[PDB]
Structures are given as structure tokens and as C-alpha cells.
Amino acid sequence: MNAAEVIVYEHVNFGGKSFDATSDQPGAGDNLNDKISSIKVKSGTWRFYEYINYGGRYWDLGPGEYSSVESAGIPDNSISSFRQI
Numbered sequence: 001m002n003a004a005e006v007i008v009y010e011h012v013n014f015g016g017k018s019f020d021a022t023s024d025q026p027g028a029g030d031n032l033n034d035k036i037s038s039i040k041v042k043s044g045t046w047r048f049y050e051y052i053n054y055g056g057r058y059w060d061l062g063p064g065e066y067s068s069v070e071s072a073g074i075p076d077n078s079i080s081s082f083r084q085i
Contacts, residue, residue, distance in 0.1 A: 004043045006084045013038045013067045024084060031080040038067030050080035 007020040016037060019025065031050075041061060049056040050073040057073070073080065 004085065006046070007040045007042065009038045009040070009067075011037050012069070027084060028081045033074055033077040035072070035074065035080075036069040038065065040065040044085060046082055046084055048080075048082040050078060052079060053081070056080075 002022055005020055005022050006025055007018065008025070009016045009018040011017060039061060041063060045060050045062045047058060047060045049058050051057060
């Protein structure tokens with residue numbers, strides 16, 4: 001089953017690469033700390049958490065687009081991941 005288009009840009013909103021795969025995107029894997037891009041959702045909601053796979057800042061995003069680059073999570077270095085649902 002597939003019914004959720006997730007469009008996220010892998011960079012700034014004025015010169016970056018975007019992708020909208022309708023079959024589970026690569027997601028967050030090569031994260032770290034120096035992350036800067038924009039997020040766009042147009043179907044349901046997801047759960048964004050920057051930490052280990054067992055406990056972290058649980059923050060789900062809903063209908064809306066944003067482009068943070070100094071508030072989301074830029075401490076120094078750490079792990080992060082989000083489930084595209």
C-alpha cells in the first residue's frame with residue numbers, strides 16, 4: 001500500500017536538490033549536525049527526532065512548509081531520524 005507523497009529538499013530553498021518518492025524515501029541516515037534545508041508535507045504527518053534509536057526529542061510536523069537553518073538542531077554532532085508516515 002502507498003498513499004503519502006513526501007516532498008523534502010536536501011538544501012536551501014533557493015538552490016538545492018528536491019525529491020518526492022512515493023515509495024518510502026531514503027529518510028535520515030547520513031545526518032550529523034551541519035544540516036540545513038526545508039521541509040514540505042502535503043499528506044498526514046511525520047515524526048522528527050534527533051537522537052539515538054531509543055529516546056530523543058520527539059517532534060512531529062504537520063501540514064506546512066518551513067526552512068530552518070539555526071533552530072532545528074545544530075549543536076555540534078549527533079544522530080537523527082524521522083519516520084515518513
